[PDB]
Each structure stands twice: as structure tokens, then as C-alpha cells.
Amino acid sequence: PLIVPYNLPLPGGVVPRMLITILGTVKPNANRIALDFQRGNDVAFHFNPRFNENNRRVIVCNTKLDNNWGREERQSVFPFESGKPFKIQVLVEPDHFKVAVNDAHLLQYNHRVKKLNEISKLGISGDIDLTSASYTMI
Ligand SMILES: CC(=O)N[C@H]1[C@H](Oc2ccc([N+](=O)[O-])cc2)O[C@H](CO)[C@@H](O[C@@H]2O[C@H](CO)[C@H](O)[C@H](OS(=O)(=O)O)[C@H]2O)[C@@H]1O
């Protein structure tokens, strides 16, 4: 098991055909989960399941440049459940990150940060027990 918040270095940045797999279990009464793909202080891709935003569950995705959040992309399909194990797979494609949860496609996020090889860390945080976090080339 891994300590949260957890930093996964991505040596040499991300590249198309890179697949990141995260296994964990959502804590009971969870509030939030966050994946943060970072380019230095910037957040290239923030993937943020929210379990109670005005009594709705929503996934918020965004980019942070020079400390400023951009336009949010919101997904109301919500595959996470308090107390239950999950698998997140993030596949880097030429034009987007492609996210599947529990083997089902969830969303795509078009690349706003264009220097993919400078996106050199993934931060994993929030109300989870983290079982594994790894990458492979497919
Ligand atoms: C419905 C909605 O849009 N809510 C956003 C709200 O928007 C409005 C705020 C005020 C007014 N007003 O006053 O009328 C109108 C809109 O602004 C918040 C601050 O930007 C957003 O929260 C941030 O969202 C980020 C991702 O985008 C990160 O997740 C971040 O968390 S962090 O720890 O990583 O750094 C988190 O704070 C909210 O999602």
C-alpha cells in the first residue's frame, strides 16, 4: 500500500501510448479524489471526482496555468462509490488523455498543455486507500 498524497514520477514526461493504472478503494463517506498531472507548478490535467457538490456527484477536469484554473469540463457520469475498490486507467493519446474506470470508458480531456514530455509527475490525493500506481507502454 502507498501513502496518500502520493507522487508518481513520470520519467521524461508523458508520451502517447503511455498507460497509467491506479488501483485503490474509496474511503467511506468520501468527499473528493484528485489526480494531478503536473508540469512544474502547472497542472496539465486535474481529474477531480467530487462526491457532494450541492448534493450532486460530478467529475471536474481542468488545467492550472500560472496559478489560475481554466474552464472546467464536467462529467456527470460518476463510476466511483464510497467504500468500494476502483481501477483508473489513463491512456495518453496524441490529442487527449483518455480515462476509463473499472474497464469502462469515462471521458477524454484534450491536451491544453502541449509540452507532453514536460508533464513529469502525477499526484494522487483525496479520500482513498491507494493500492498501486504504475505505468506501462502499450
Ligand atoms: C460550480 C463551479 O464552477 N464551482 C467552481 C467555482 O466556480 C465559481 C466560484 C465562484 C463563483 N461566484 O462567486 O459567483 C462562481 C463560480 O470556483 C472554484 C474555485 O476555482 C472551483 O473549485 C476549484 O476547482 C478546481 C478545478 O477547476 C480545483 O478542483 C480546485 O481545488 S484544488 O485543491 O485542486 O486547488 C477547486 O478549489 C469550483 O469548482
CA dihedral for 63, 49, 98, 73, sign (positive or negative): negative
13 is in an annotated binding site: no
Q: Check: CB of residue 12 under 8 Å from CB of residue 119.
A: no
Ligand 1 pocket test, candidate residues 41, 47, 60, most atoms within 8 A of CB: 60
112 is in an annotated binding site: no
- Give the list of residues 6+ apart from residue 123 with CB closer than 8 angstroms, or none: 5, 6, 7, 8, 34, 35, 36, 38
CA distance 36 to 23: 16
DSSP structure class, residue 95: S
Q: Which atom of ligand 1 is nearest to the CA of 69?
A: 27
For residue 136, give the amino acid letter: T
Task: Supply the DSSP string of 25-59, one letter for each residue.
Answer: EEPTT--BEEEEEEETTEEEEEEEEEEEETTEEEE
Ligand 1 neighbours, Cβ below 6 Å, are 46, 48, 60, 62, 69, 72
C-alpha cell at 60: 471536474
73 is in an annotated binding site: yes
- Give the list of residues 6+ apart from residue 37 with CB closer than 8 angstroms, or none: 10, 14, 43, 44, 45, 46, 97, 119, 121, 122
DSSP structure class, residue 2: B
User: How many beta carbons lie within 10 A of that of residue 17, not counting itself?
Assistant: 12
C-alpha cell at 105: 470508458
Cα 12 to ligand 1 centre (Å): 31
Domains parsed from the chain with CATH numbers = 6-137 (2.60.120.200)
Q: Name the nearest CA neighbour of 99 among 39, 33, 52, 54.
A: 33
If residue 128 lies in a helix (H) or strand (E), which one and from where to where? strand 128-137
Q: Check: CB of residue 110 under 8 Å from CB of residue 99.
A: no
Burial degree of 3 (CB within 10 A; 0-12, 13-18, 19+): exposed
- The Cβ-side half-sphere exposure at 138, using a 13 Å CA radius, reads 13
CA distance 90 to 108: 9
Cα 54 to ligand 1 centre (Å): 13
Give the SS3 label for residue 116. Answer: helix
